[PDB]
Amino acid sequence: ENLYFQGDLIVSMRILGKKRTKTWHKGTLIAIQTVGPGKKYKVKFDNKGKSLLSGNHIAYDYHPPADKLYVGSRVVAKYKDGNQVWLYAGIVAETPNVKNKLRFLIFFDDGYASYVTQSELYPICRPLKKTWEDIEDISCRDFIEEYVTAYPNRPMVLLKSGQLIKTEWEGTWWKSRVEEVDGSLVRILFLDDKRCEWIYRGSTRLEPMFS
Ligand SMILES: COc1cc2nc(NCCCCCN(C)C)nc(NCCCCCCN(C)C)c2cc1OC
């Protein structure tokens, strides 16, 4: 059937949709279609394209209050490396507290981690019951499942700037150094190529956590 209404979704509403690039883009919900329990959402993207999307591949074009965001909430968050300024899917790992200076920790689907503010977050419209089950990468997916379900039990390694440690990259250990800690995140310098990465201090990519 064609629906005009589904939960708090209404045809002709402005919405974010997931493109095949895995980045999310502003569009218009132009149809809702049912097939038994199954629901699909037809989006007309503002620049280029129509897609027929699952409810977990559309996001509201508003910022939720803090009260509607939990550890495990499925979100789209802004990420910015220079002029590359894009919306990507992730999971809320941490809600605002004194220790994180009232920020949201996001674990992106691609294994990047970042603190963001409310103004950087959009809620996914129809997340899965197990929010993490639509993370394509199995190792990220299994990690987030364990993290979210054990929360607030979070083994983390206490690290200090200058500390020499082994960090995982593409399935091997690399000589590295702790450059900076910011709440639950450590900035690791890989000594081989002199590049940095922000890593969750409870990640098994940190050899001390792994052991
Ligand atoms: C803003 O500051 C940073 C931005 C970085 N951006 C990228 N890339 C852009 C891809 C974005 C992904 C999008 N996702 C979230 C959806 N990468 C970084 N570091 C890569 C690590 C290489 C280590 C390599 C180690 N050797 C041994 C191979 C970055 C570090 C940064 O801080 C120090």
From Swiss-Prot:
Concerning PTM, the database record says: Degraded by the proteasome, shielded by interaction with ATF7IP. The conjugated-Ub is protected from deubiquitination by the SET domain.
- State the tissue distribution: Widely expressed. High expression in testis.
Q: Where is the Tudor domain?
A: 68-131, 158-211
Where in the cell is the protein located? Nucleus; Cytoplasm; Chromosome
> The organism sits in which domain of life?
Eukaryota
Another remark in the UniProt entry says: Highly up-regulated in Huntington disease patients, suggesting that participates in the altered chromatin modulation and transcription dysfunction observed in Huntington disease. Its down-regulation has salubrious effects on patients, suggesting that it may be a promising treatment in Huntington disease patients.
Give the family this protein belongs to, as stated in its UniProt record: Belongs to the class V-like SAM-binding methyltransferase superfamily. Histone-lysine methyltransferase family. Suvar3-9 subfamily.
Cite the domain annotation text. Answer: The pre-SET, SET and post-SET domains are all required for methyltransferase activity. The 347-amino-acid insertion in the SET domain has no effect on the catalytic activity.
Subunit structure, as described in the record: Part of a complex containing at least CDYL, REST, WIZ, SETDB1, EHMT1 and EHMT2. Forms a complex with ATRX, TRIM28 and ZNF274. Probably part of a corepressor complex containing ZNF304, TRIM28, SETDB1 and DNMT1. Interacts with TRIM28/TIF1B. Interacts with ATF7IP and ATF7IP2; the interaction with ATF7IP protects SETDB1 from proteasomal degradation and is required to stimulate histone methyltransferase activity and facilitate the conversion of dimethylated to trimethylated H3 'Lys-9'. Interacts with CBX1 and CBX5. Interacts with DNMT3A and DNMT3B. Interacts with SUMO2. Interacts with MPHOSPH8.
Described by its record, this protein's role is as follows: Histone methyltransferase that specifically trimethylates 'Lys-9' of histone H3. H3 'Lys-9' trimethylation represents a specific tag for epigenetic transcriptional repression by recruiting HP1 (CBX1, CBX3 and/or CBX5) proteins to methylated histones. Mainly functions in euchromatin regions, thereby playing a central role in the silencing of euchromatic genes. H3 'Lys-9' trimethylation is coordinated with DNA methylation. Required for HUSH-mediated heterochromatin formation and gene silencing.
Return the protein name.
Histone-lysine N-methyltransferase SETDB1
Q: Corresponding gene?
A: SETDB1
Included stretch of the parent chain:
196 to 400 of 1291
